[PDB]
Ligand binder design. Structure first.
Ligand code: HEM
Ligand SMILES: [Cu+2]
Length: 153
């Protein structure tokens, strides 16, 4: 679990994300999609965006990133007591979108990369460690709900 201070480190960098959710969302997806192209295949509505220029030009990819980061931020503000928010996400990501738990680890990597590329002076090792811990808590909880809904993460 995370200490209150660890949560505050997480929420301080998240306050920076909220200043430009769409920009962070784009950077995270472009990183994810490039580093791990199997993630772009799972985003089948966007898999026709072959190049970074096409990715950046897509208004609907940008909206999808706001949708996902808005939901993540609500989860983080709940500081571990995110059962409410997790339940629909688990449902859809397990049974509709079919996202393996390992892809959430890919996403956590991309998030941490973007946050330190955009906010050095707010993301040193302690903050990075708190954010890592928070996303790992998230993933472990999603993993559990996957198993309860059936069929492995
Ligand atoms: C940080 C954890 C993430 C959060 C908070 C998040 C949140 C969401 C939300 C709120 C939606 C719209 C509602 C829904 O369908 O449930 C969505 C859709 C989706 N997410 Fe995620 N997501 C997460 C991670 C991922 C990852 C890691 C993948 C794939 C590598 C992914 C793939 C998808 C896809 C393919 C859709 C549907 C987009 C479409 O409408 O075309 N999600 N996600
Ligand atoms: Cu996405």
């Amino acid at each position: 679990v995370l200490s209150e201070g660890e949560w505050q480190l997480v929420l301080h960098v998240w306050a920076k994300v909220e200043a430009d959710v769409a920009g962070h969302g784009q950077d995270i997806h472009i990183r994810l999609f490039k580093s791990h192209p199997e993630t772009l295949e799972k985003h089948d509505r966007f898999k026709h965006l072959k190049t970074e220029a096409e990715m950046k030009a897509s208004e609907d990819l940008k909206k999808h990133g706001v949708t996902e980061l808005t939901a993540l931020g609500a989860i983080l503000k709940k500081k571990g007591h995110h059962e409410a928010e997790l339940k629909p996400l688990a449902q859809s990501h397990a049974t509709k979108h079919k996202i393996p738990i390992k892809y959430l680890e890919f996403e956590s990597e991309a998030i941490i990369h973007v946050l330190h590329s955009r906010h050095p002076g707010d993301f040193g090792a302690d903050a990075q460690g708190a954010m890592n811990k928070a996303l790992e808590l998230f993933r472990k909880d999603i993993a559990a709900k996957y198993k309860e809904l059936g069929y492995q993460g």
